[PDB]
Amino acid sequence: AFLTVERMESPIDSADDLAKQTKIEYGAVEDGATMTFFKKSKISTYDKMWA
Amino acid sequence: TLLNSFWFGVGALMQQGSELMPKALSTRIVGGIWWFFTLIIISSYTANLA
Numbered sequence A: 001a002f003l004t005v006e007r008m009e010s011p012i013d014s015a016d017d018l019a020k021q022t023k024i025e026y027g028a029v030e031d032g033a034t035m036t037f038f039k040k041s042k043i044s045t046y047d048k049m050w051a
Numbered sequence B: 001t002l003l004n005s006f007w008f009g010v011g012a013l014m015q016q017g018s019e020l021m022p023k024a025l026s027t028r029i030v031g032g033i034w035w036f037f038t039l040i041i042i043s044s045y046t047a048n049l050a
């Protein structure tokens, strides 16, 4: 178990893993099409990421 | 001899004890640290073999 068990993976792996884990802080750029994307989308995660 | 010294090193590498277990503490430390070498080499082999 101390030679091959696993690699220490990142706590986040996707968009919804940021949607739950409030320890890892978000981020985007002001005046951007990424910020505008979360401002104007509503599908169950990307409003929560803009919340 | 040089034949019997290499039959200690191959013997203690394969976990099969030989006929010539050393006396004379200076050679028991050589025999004792080659036992701990081949203990770790085999137990790392058979734990990674799966």
Ligand SMILES: C=C(C)[C@H]1CN[C@H](C(=O)O)[C@H]1CC(=O)O
Pocket (backbone or CB within 6 Å): A029, A030, A031, A032, A033, A034, A035
């Ligand atoms: C560097 C910035 C603000 C620009 C670069 N092109 C994108 C754009 O022009 O919309 C932006 C990146 C982003 O939206 O994250």
